[PDB]
From a paper:
In contrast, replacement of the first 12 N-terminal amino acids of [name] with the TT epitope resulted in well assembled VLPs with a size of approximately 30–40 nm in diameter, as shown by electron microscopy (EM) and dynamic light scattering (DLS), preserving the native T = 3 icosahedral structure. We next characterized the molecular structure of the newly generated CMVTT VLPs by [name]. High resolution images were captured and more than 6600 VLPs were picked for averaging, resulting in several 2D classes of VLPs; the best of these were used for 3D- classification. This allowed construction of a 9 Å model, followed by refinement to 4.2 Å, and fitting of the primary sequence into the structure. The structure of CMVTT appeared largely identical to the parent [name] particles (RMSD 1.8 Å), particularly at the surface. Specifically, the subunit arrangement of the asymmetric unit (chains A, B and C) was identical between the parent virus and the modified VLPs. The AA dimers were arranged at the 5-fold axis and the BC dimers around the 3-fold/ pseudo 6-fold axis. Upon closer inspection there were minor differences in the spatial location of the backbone polypeptide in the capsid interior, most likely due to the lack of native viral capsid–genome interactions in the recombinant VLPs. Instead, the modified VLP exhibited additional electron density displaying 3-fold symmetry within the interior cavity (orange color), indicative of novel ordered structures, most likely reflecting tightly bound internal RNA. Interestingly, their relative location and resemblance to tightly-associated RNA species would suggest they might contribute towards stabilizing of intra-subunit associations underlying the overall stability of the particles. A further intriguing aspect of the structure is the relatively large pore size, which may allow for the exchange of naturally bound RNA by other poly-anions or other cargo.
Residue numbers in the entry:
A (entry chain B), D (entry chain B), H (entry chain B), I (entry chain B): 29 to 218
B (entry chain A), C (entry chain A): 66 to 218
E (entry chain C), F (entry chain C), G (entry chain C): 28 to 218
The structure:
Amino acid sequence: DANFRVLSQQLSRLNKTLAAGRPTINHPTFVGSERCRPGYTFTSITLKPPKIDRGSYYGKRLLLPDSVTEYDKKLVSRLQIRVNPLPKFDSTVWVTVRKVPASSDLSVAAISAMFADGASPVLVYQYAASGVQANNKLLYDLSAMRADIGDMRKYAVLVYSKDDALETDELVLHVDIEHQRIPTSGVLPV
Amino acid sequence: PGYTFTSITLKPPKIDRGSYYGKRLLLPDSVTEYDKKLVSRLQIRVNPLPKFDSTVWVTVRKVPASSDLSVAAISAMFADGASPVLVYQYAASGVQANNKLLYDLSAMRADIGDMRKYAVLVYSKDDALETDELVLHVDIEHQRIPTSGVLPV
Amino acid sequence: PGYTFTSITLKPPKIDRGSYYGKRLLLPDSVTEYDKKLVSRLQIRVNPLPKFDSTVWVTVRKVPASSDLSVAAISAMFADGASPVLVYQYAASGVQANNKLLYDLSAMRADIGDMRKYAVLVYSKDDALETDELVLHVDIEHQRIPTSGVLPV
Amino acid sequence: DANFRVLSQQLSRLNKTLAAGRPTINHPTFVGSERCRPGYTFTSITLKPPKIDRGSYYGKRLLLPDSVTEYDKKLVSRLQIRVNPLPKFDSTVWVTVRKVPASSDLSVAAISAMFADGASPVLVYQYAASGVQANNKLLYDLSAMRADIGDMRKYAVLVYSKDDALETDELVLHVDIEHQRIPTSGVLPV
Amino acid sequence: ADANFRVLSQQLSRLNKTLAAGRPTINHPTFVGSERCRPGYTFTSITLKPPKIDRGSYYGKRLLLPDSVTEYDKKLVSRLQIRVNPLPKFDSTVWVTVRKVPASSDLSVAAISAMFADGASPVLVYQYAASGVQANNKLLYDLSAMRADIGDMRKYAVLVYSKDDALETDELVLHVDIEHQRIPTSGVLPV
Amino acid sequence: ADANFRVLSQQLSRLNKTLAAGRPTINHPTFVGSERCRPGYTFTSITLKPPKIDRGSYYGKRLLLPDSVTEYDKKLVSRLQIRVNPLPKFDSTVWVTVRKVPASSDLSVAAISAMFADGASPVLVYQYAASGVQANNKLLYDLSAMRADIGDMRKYAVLVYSKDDALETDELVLHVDIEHQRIPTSGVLPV
Amino acid sequence: ADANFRVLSQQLSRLNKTLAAGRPTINHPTFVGSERCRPGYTFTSITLKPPKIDRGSYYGKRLLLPDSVTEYDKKLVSRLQIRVNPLPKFDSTVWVTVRKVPASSDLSVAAISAMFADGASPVLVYQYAASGVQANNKLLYDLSAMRADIGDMRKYAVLVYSKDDALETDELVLHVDIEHQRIPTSGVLPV
Amino acid sequence: DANFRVLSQQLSRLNKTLAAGRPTINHPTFVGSERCRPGYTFTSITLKPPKIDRGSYYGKRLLLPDSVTEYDKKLVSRLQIRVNPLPKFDSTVWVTVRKVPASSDLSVAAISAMFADGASPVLVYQYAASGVQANNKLLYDLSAMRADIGDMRKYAVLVYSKDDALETDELVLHVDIEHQRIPTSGVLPV
Amino acid sequence: DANFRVLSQQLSRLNKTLAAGRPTINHPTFVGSERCRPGYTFTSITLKPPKIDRGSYYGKRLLLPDSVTEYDKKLVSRLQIRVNPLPKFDSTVWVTVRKVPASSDLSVAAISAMFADGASPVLVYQYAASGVQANNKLLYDLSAMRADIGDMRKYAVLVYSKDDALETDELVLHVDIEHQRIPTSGVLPV
């Protein structure tokens, strides 16, 4: 009665925390996702860079599929970076989800300056001969800002191949975005 | 109730004068994974972009023999006259009675997996139905999509 | 209520230009054994498969004199104009007002046995009505089929 | 009061059992059917073999009329074999309703092996000059398996003429199938 | 004896009928006995005589009635009965059946042998034995559930099949006994 | 209904089984029906094929089992069963017996005909008749009193005797159905 | 202990499973142990053998079943499992995945490497190390929320990828263990 | 309460009586034995006649095995005749268990006179081509006379082959005797 | 009072689980045994293979010492594999405790097929220059099957040297078996 309740919420924090990243049998290599919030669903984006040079920076503005850009009032809870590696891979990548002011600036070599301030978390990923890296999944949160789908144009993902010019089929990227449900029909279609 | 109107737009390629056409009901794969879900009534719609001057004998049912091929053997299948047929020769908004028909399955409950066995069968009669003249629509009714509660892994 | 819609599909054979046709109402034998059952309203429907270009003067009533033969003596029977007639010269889904008429018998209660005495009478006017052009439908209403509780012996 | 009730159910078993097969005046030669269950109705199949050879085996998969194959979700309570003899008859037949795995095997001369295991009851029928055999009606039950009309494709009837090549008009066969009511209309037909 | 022995008495009375279905009782030692007519209804017989059909030939026959019966074509028909009484000189075989032919919707030529096959009605066989005369030669086809009348008795048709011989007209008689209500009584002053 | 109709209900239920021991019931019209397996136990079949022994020759055969069954040789055996299923071409005669041979204490050469004589076990005959196929071809030998197990099923031996013919291998199949407990269920993570 | 220690007991029992997710326990010191089958369901294995595909080649394979399982295609499937058991001579690498291919809507030619990219399913890697054998080689993909049956097991497809070598057929076996309900028990008298 | 008890004993008589001889599935050809009484056990005798002539009478005095003849005070409840047929058999036999006065008379052709009086039941057995005879088991009762094992010498079995001289291996006979338990040991053996 | 009791049993699970394998000071290199159950004792077997070839499979049926094989009714709780390494060791071994059907099959090269099904846990052991492997002790449980000492003949241990032909003195094996107490004497010996 409101005394074991606060103790139960303390221990449930430790169950999440002590199982942050360990090779659990439900997903033994790559770290598992967290559950979508009741309400919201997800929506993916596969972005393909052009063949940029060896060790070159890369800028990319976030667009969306056009069925999503209709309802530009619904909120965006969190967004996600998946970096799924296909087998032939020896390179390194850094991924970042910073806020570029929209069309206030370019993306030419000031991107390497944008890695320096650290206003956002930075996802590294590197090849090891010892084994594949277990943790390749960043979650950048947005629930405090109450942003919407209409503000998703403002953000920009920043990619950096370092030790190689990235071949277009050595490592795919993804930007998964969690927003509310696209509104359901039910009217008589004409 | 509990339904979000799944639209599939399937345009048929080019016909000659007095020739048939068949095409099977292939759906998006977010729907096909919901194979158990009960399927209510369905309808078709014929929306022409202008440059249109033609008329059609569109009718859809299950193709027998588990989807044997659908050219010139549906000529016997248009010879029965069991289900009604939509004939569009009006070319003005309102002169046509209706763009739509009915194929209810509430007692049948032929599911999403049974939509693999259905095939739109098309007859054309005039002008051989050149490019961009009509845009066929087929709208189905089937119990509401359960969304995943897990972000991609 | 209490009724399952008994459909009988009777296509008429080939006519000449300006000739009549008659055919009696024969039903499936699972229905004819239910002779006592009360019969409500009935209707006809004209569904053409395409290749169709014709028009008809379909009208059904009881043939008198206990089914005397039904060629060229129904020309006087189309000369009265008592019951309405369906004329199909539209050839598009919705341009026609209606494919259906009405012959209610709720006060008459002319039973299943009295369906032996009815005869579809057909007039054709254009194109002599060649093969597979129209598929006639006639749908009746009559108290619900009692199924047997005994497996075959 | 719940004491003669159990005695009444015991004696009613004996009324069925002691009248299993006797030439009752309601049906004096062939054994009578049992009543269809409240709910279910029946549906017949007359199967006609091709002219197979003298003493040859015979396989046949169960199909249905196409009006039945629509509602392939409704249950099948029991199925029945009638072997009605027409007058000119001197031969012998064996009928069996086994479960063949669907398209996992052929039906060529392993059918005589399928008579041997005895996983299903076997209906014999033979001519006698002493008189016509009184019992020519097998009931194979299916209420425990909760099978449907969609599983009726899986079964196969196995026929064996023994002492003769079967003429097509010396003995008819039937497969009567008891399933639920094909769903009633009541909508305004168009 | 208060609604608890009553249900036990109705169970045992079923067994008295059932265990005495066919046995050579002393009240009728060779042919199986009839059942009692229902209170109300009476009976009415028909002797039908086929023409000399060929050896092993099928035979169709529509049910007519005597004309005094065909007047009151509204009264119900409870059950009908087939008696096959054998006269002494007999060695042949017969099959009798009481099926529903759709009235004038079809003929009776050699599709009768197809009508034996479906089994929608019970089939009465009868055959000679040198071991003795067959004890059971009496079919009762019931009609109380359909609520048919005398006016529907035209629709039925009896189907006869001599098998091992061409039937001589005086080797075996047939009968169709029909149980319907009482033909209405007079009592008016006749003129 | 308080411990006085209970004993009367158990008496009448004996008569329902007994008076329906063998009669051509519509659920199985020719061969006698099986009895229900006990809650718990399941069954397991054996088809045995003799070599072509001579005309009227005896035959011995020890009971083996499939090797998946011989693992759990501690579980009990409730009853065992003989099915003799006839295929159509058949005119011969067979006798089947389920006696206890002492295991490897003796041979099976022509003392088998002496083993038919003592009658310590029931003997299933089966013979062809032109009058018709024999309705009863199913022996049940009980074992619930001895509390034997699957490990003792090696000790028994089935004894077959073709009499009027040398048995062709495809005129009549035999079976030995054995009712024992459930082979133990898995549920562990397989590796 | 009244609905207040009950919720605390369920919290700590989560930590006993979680803190013992993978550690070399003495009950199974090298390969991670299975979880217990649910009360009800049993298991059924499949050993799949690829043809000799090339070095670093993709591989597609549709899930079939043994034919005794494909009979009862109405019973549910709780979970399915991937075991990758290594035999000793092994230096290669494999990736195993249990994705949903739409049934006969597409081929399996080199779009399989695209199917690794979306990440709608967990991906089991396995690689040789000279430091030692990898302790975790057992994926469990769950299906209890979808209420799928045995009849839907045809729709799934396992995706294998040898990477650093052309896979010899006897360097590493694969398995697909499937947990579904009990195949229905007999108990009827066998004929 | 002592009113359904007498009704239960009436119906249990009918269960035995209506199942006197019918081919039950527990023993389908030869009629089954009855249960030994609590107490008593059984003891068998196989008797082998010499090759007597065609249609000849046969006398045989009842002896016992010598382990049984020790305790000649214990009672004899009932005795039994089994006539087990081996396959090659076409003959006929009559078996009878009469009381011959011990050494007061011979057994030469007055045995056929001993069949005539009918003071004991007579078991016939005959071959039929229609099938093997189902009933081949006589039980002669002795519980009223209170005889013992010492009086079993007085009885004599009477066999009559009729249609053939009996070959010694066409049909075996048996005399099964139900008496009390031969007394159990338990002393320290020396 | 029956509420801290269930919490105490939850935490005691975590004390075992979080101390599954760690280098505790009571046994710093090889993982410790678990306590024998009250009742049962243990019994060892050292098995010595012949010099099989390089990378060759190996089969071996479980026998026992003859003093144990007397009381073949007593139960077997669990059995154990110890793989004790002596110093000169660079090879690799796999050990498995599968159920071979007794004399139903050989052990020639189908043993490598028996590794594939995974019906039993598989103990690997490999040399590392980084250090000796800490976990070399499999426990296969048998308490659910209620097997006895008489069924220990049915099992077979499967050994596989992989990278070398095993010298007979580079690595010993053991099979420790936990069964009940061999029955105690106390009678006056003669």
